[PDB]
Structure formats: C-alpha cells, structure tokens
Amino acid sequence: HHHHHSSGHIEGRHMQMKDLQAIKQEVSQAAPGSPQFMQTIRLAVQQFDPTAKDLQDLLQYLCSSLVASLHHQQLDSLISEAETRGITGYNPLAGPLRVQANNPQQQGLRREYQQLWLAAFAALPGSAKDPSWASILQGLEEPYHAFVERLNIALDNGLPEGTPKDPILRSLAYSNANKECQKLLQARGHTNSPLGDMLRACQTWTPKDKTKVL
Numbered sequence: 001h002h003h004h005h006s007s008g009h010i011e012g013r014h015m016q017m018k019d020l021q022a023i024k025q026e027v028s029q030a031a032p033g034s035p036q037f038m039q040t041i042r043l044a045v046q047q048f049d050p051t052a053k054d055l056q057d058l059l060q061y062l063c064s065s066l067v068a069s070l071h072h073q074q075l076d077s078l079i080s081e082a083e084t085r086g087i088t089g090y091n092p093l094a095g096p097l098r099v100q101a102n103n104p105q106q107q108g109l110r111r112e113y114q115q116l117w118l119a120a121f122a123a124l125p126g127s128a129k130d131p132s133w134a135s136i137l138q139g140l141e142e143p144y145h146a147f148v149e150r151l152n153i154a155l156d157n158g159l160p161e162g163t164p165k166d167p168i169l170r171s172l173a174y175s176n177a178n179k180e181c182q183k184l185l186q187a188r189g190h191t192n193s194p195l196g197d198m199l200r201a202c203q204t205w206t207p208k209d210k211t212k213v214l
Contacts, residue, residue: 014102015050020061027062035129037062038122045114052098055117067124074120082112131158133168137176144181144202148173148195173198181205 023044030037041062044050050058059068083092088108091100100106101113121127133154138147151172152165159165173195174185181202185191188201 015048015054019048020058024062033126033130038127041121042118045118049114052101052113071120071124074123075116078116078119129158133158133172136172138178138181140178140180144205145199148199170195
C-alpha cells in the first residue's frame, strides 16, 4: 500500500456518460411530442454543450435509429448552407467537420453546431408541441356552448397571432361538430355566419314540440 492515494486522474470536459444518463431521465419525464423533451436538450447544450462527437452518440442515445438518419440528413443540409458560405472560420481544406466542432479552438463554429444540431433536433416530425384543438370537436352529448367557449381558450393556448383564430374557431365549432350538430347548423342555415349565431343555434339544439297552448 505505502500511503493511500496515487497519481493519475482524468476528468475531461465534453459531456460524459452520466451526463447523458441524467438527460435520459429528465427526458424520460418529458411527454411524447411536447415542448419538454427538446427543451431539455437545449438545457444540456446550454449546460456543458456537447460537441459533435457527443451529439453523435446523443443522437443514437435518446433519439431513435431512423430519426438519427432523418436528422443526419437535416444537418447535412444545414451544413450545406454553412460550408457553402465558407462558415465563419471553418477549415474546408481539412476535410472533416465534426473535428472542427470538437476542436478546442473553434468557438464560433462549435457554437453554431450546437444550435445547428438542435435545429435538426427540432426539425423532426415530432420534436415539438402540437395543436390540442386539432382534436377538439363538439360531442354528440356535450355543452356546445361551453365547448365553443373552451375551443376559444384551448385555441389561444396554441394559436399564434400569425394564424387566425376567429375563423379557426368557427371551423372547430362547425367543421369539427358532431353529426346532429353539423346537421343543426345546416338545418339552421347560418353556416357562413358569426359565432354569436352558432350559440343561438345550439342554444336550443332541439325540435320544439308543442300543439296549441292551454
């Protein structure tokens, strides 16, 4: 033994395994097709910032196989734009790329790669949020009125100013209305009308039955 402890101790800095393990966790919590997983990625990239190498594994670590490919294709394109522009201070004479991104000298490209990657990572057909109203329709036995109200909310919940809601709403209220509903609106003959009329058409949503009073 002769005294404890001994020379030798490599630490390094480039996102270790345990680092990926932790991510896998915080990610495992994320939801399928929600701004939770991807977000966690930016956290890791903003934490230590995994080089190209790390990204490589991270790709075949969290993401799926196929996805890895699709993504691999994304970058190939992204880079195409970079290399094309000659990139800040890239070395096209060298040949490799990830090498430069893993080079403890290039901070301009290294960073660009971090975002570039996340780009493809967020360019996946299921690496972000989604419209919940995209699956919201008036139930055959639901409070159309209340539904319309919510539809508006649930909408604003995922309705970018860049996109219209006034109509989208009238579309989710009608275009996305049960049968008896769609039949009501039509039978009412007020499709191409305001919502106010829609609530006045469902206000009853029932064939008034009566024969003389008293």
